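Record type: ASSEMBLY
Status: queued
Input:
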Amino acid sequence: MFQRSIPALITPFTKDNLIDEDSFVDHIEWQISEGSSGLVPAGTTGESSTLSYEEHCRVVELCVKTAAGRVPVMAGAGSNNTKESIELAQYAQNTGADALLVVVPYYNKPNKKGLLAHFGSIANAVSLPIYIYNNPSRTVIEMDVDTMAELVKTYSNIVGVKDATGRIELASGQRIACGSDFIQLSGDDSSALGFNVHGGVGCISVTANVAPRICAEFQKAISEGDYRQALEYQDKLFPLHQALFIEPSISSVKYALSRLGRNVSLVVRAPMVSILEKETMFAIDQALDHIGLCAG
Amino acid sequence: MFQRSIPALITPFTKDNLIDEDSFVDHIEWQISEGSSGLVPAGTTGESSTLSYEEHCRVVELCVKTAAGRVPVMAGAGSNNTKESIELAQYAQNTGADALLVVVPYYNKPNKKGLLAHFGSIANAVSLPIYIYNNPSRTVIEMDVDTMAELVKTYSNIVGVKDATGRIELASGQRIACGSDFIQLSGDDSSALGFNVHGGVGCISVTANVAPRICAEFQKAISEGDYRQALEYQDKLFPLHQALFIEPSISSVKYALSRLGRNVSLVVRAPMVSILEKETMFAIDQALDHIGLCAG
Amino acid sequence: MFQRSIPALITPFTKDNLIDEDSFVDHIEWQISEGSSGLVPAGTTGESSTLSYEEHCRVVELCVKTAAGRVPVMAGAGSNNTKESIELAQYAQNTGADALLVVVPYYNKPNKKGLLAHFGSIANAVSLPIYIYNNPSRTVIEMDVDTMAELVKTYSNIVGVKDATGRIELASGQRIACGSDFIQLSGDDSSALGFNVHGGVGCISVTANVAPRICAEFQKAISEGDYRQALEYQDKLFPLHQALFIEPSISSVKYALSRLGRNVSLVVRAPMVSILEKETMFAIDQALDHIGLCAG
Amino acid sequence: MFQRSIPALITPFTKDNLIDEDSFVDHIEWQISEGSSGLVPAGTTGESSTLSYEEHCRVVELCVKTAAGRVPVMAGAGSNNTKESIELAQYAQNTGADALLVVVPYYNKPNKKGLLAHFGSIANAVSLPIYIYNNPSRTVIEMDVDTMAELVKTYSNIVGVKDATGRIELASGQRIACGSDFIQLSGDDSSALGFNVHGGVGCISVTANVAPRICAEFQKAISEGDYRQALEYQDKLFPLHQALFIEPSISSVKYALSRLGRNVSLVVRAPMVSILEKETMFAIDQALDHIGLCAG
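Status: finished
Output:
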């Protein structure tokens, strides 16, 4: 269902700090027409932390409605509050999302029993497929392979993992412990290539917001086993993958989009800021030039 | 205003998962009568992450009402959403809190510019004193000393720090950069003794929920400069400090209070769980009995 | 020159704690005849830390003489003492080694200028090609890509890197900064597969000591672009890669060899010990059974 | 036997890269006359890693000879090679050292069983008191409290710890597990103050090489229980402690001694370098002048 290049969509805002619905719809349309194979609205790159409950639901509804069955929609239903995660997940199901992205809880640092209770509670409350989002660079705690495999064995609707660790030996461990039917998606753009050769089938991507066509061509080459061409694409994309997280990626991505001439405002929500250092903007501009996408 | 032993209060719940208002009031009154010098409602140990906005506000209101001016109240007023932080902060001010505890944002990892924007926006929105809560073991990012000093220099109501790093060299750096008038409180029970000799004047404490009298005695000895006596208390308390975070301290504290005969249910909100391993309960019971806390 | 599967050779010892020269020769012969493409004597897996200067030179001499030009020999010349590294490197050159493996200095933690001085001093003292061995899990410090690229640009005989980080995004960075002529070898068995698709051409391997034929077949499949078959080999080898570093790999490898019936004693040198936990030996035995190599 | 301020002595070298025996003797005599209470020759700050066996021995012999029983001498006698450690330890005993400093092995990462074998073999080979030097920021592995206690319980001449973690909670854990008779010395200048209030009785110090009198005064105030006075010294010394490890402290200490007019050359052995950035020298000079150390 989910494969190849899947943007973790930004959430654009107006000058007045409302959801810029027309910008969001346009970005989704453009993503689909440039070759993105799926959509993740209201994830981390979507600024889930600074959306109200209502706005989070609106972002998911609007992504589901816009996509209109053309590509599958994996709605962000992440929080560190299990009851709220259930409510987000049930809203996503009822509005027509195809799957759920559920982050390992951050900040309050549950132990293994707490992870089983969190993901089990969600799995019991919805019938949609659930993807575990493992990102210890943000959550501190990391779901281990034994816990992942136990969840996969216990609950039919826990089907996959967004693996943002960038440690691809884990892709092999997860493939052996959970089975080759388990859907593994990279959550780290710069190691997505190696992640797929170890068993992954796609990438939930920051850079795809900015360069959807080349990211789609990159993932197509991997799926066809043209790993020579995929490396050629890797070498062209890697400087952009890296430039987009010199400073926080949500600000960096929106800057890159405006420099491409897209209808996306620079506005982000505190504690994120839109101001980038001169050297950061130049690193992004040169990485975009290097993929032609700008100057050539 | 804030000094010696200050519990980061638990938020007790009923078997029906409502706020146990009677248990909360009794806990505060017991804490005061045993020597706690101040109160922090709706912090991390207070399960702020699993409280709704209205419950969080109600916990703060109740704590202010119950303290009745006997001890100062530092309300938890911080999330990783600046607008929500301002809303919790302004509620706390209008209901009569004496100060605010504002955590460095977790999960979404702002950069230094974002920290200045976050803490600056909160400081401009209230007139109450603000304490920066630095806990990188939960937030991943760490506010550095230059940023902390800039905030103190820029905003007159940014007045202190909850320093939960456990790296007491930072106490010396913050004392020099921010001034000896900057109020430093330990956020790490096990290193609170050294923290104070480096410049701190108290501890926002997990263990004080369980053992408020001995924790108050420990801090009193420190403020009297009886460091020999403070080290004897340290040796009695350290095993309990340590046993309470074998598993998440929220669950462990409520287990301990229940065992001591306090009217506190075991209930916690997912992803916390109340089930503890037997080896964990055994370690807690041994540390409680070494101190001599069972009335029976 | 160096490609595919290259064992970091163990150094066998007799009951009496001398170098077991006949065992070493036999292990080398067996490695070559099973398909290993190169040899690294007196590296980390070779217990370089507990060899005398004389014994280190003897191990390199004996590996060079045994190999007799059939496969290339990359001699360990690593220490955290630059003068001693020069002496080891010059001995290796004079005895007929084909290249040098030079670890980033451990324990004394030089800064970037110190790394330039260390690797530059060695590059000036020999004409052999030098491979940088980056392993911060043992050295704490990590050579960054700018430093690596500067060394490669400055000195003709710094030609490659043993990259033991297991973070394969670095393979892409090193490929772009140092050029595709730069020889990158994985130093992490479990991520070797993804490391090669990102630009690597081989692996300096622990597991190859134990399963040289399958490791050689694994690397052959990668070099032929049969990444489907390589993944099949990965899934068979990964449990053995992981089982060999539950406890220190030098002890684990020698245990595995004796369980295969090879003439290798269990003896290691303090502070390493030969005693393995029951659960460790069983994890290794099952991983060997899973590659048939034992039971079938 | 060991208490208050104990420099980890630098090893000065000549322009020809020989041991500057005259400079070393003058440094020791100056350290004693300024209040240092003991001496550690041929430790980390003494560039043990770049000394030959015969130079290391000569540094220890000279330090013992020069101290002339006025202050005790704790010889560096530890590498990551147990047999070499025994040889350095036995030399130190036979030349008249009072105790031994034995680092947890670096680079080759023994497990707990290996630590027991390492420290046990050394303890059985000498009758001198042994101090465990725990410095995971250099060794990666960290001796845990259970292992330390087992060693103290098993070997009567394992008597104390050099604890360079900077995590003073470990001081409380070691005091409880090993006994209040276990001698704890800080290995981290910046946290030495809190370390002592948690149970320590002195500091094996980098900064004491540069500022031995004020460091001795600082430690004297602590042992007198004048913690208010100790905090005033902390505030004066902390900027110097910090400035001396902007770049490797070996280079920074010799730079500072040279600037103060001591007969100590700048020479260091690769991979250390004597060249410091101007911003580093400026920070050191400012911290030296804040204390008032320039005679001119």
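Annotation: Residues 4-291 of chain C form a domain with the TIM Barrel fold (CATH 3.20.20.70).
Annotation: Chains C and B do not touch (no CB pair under 8 Å).
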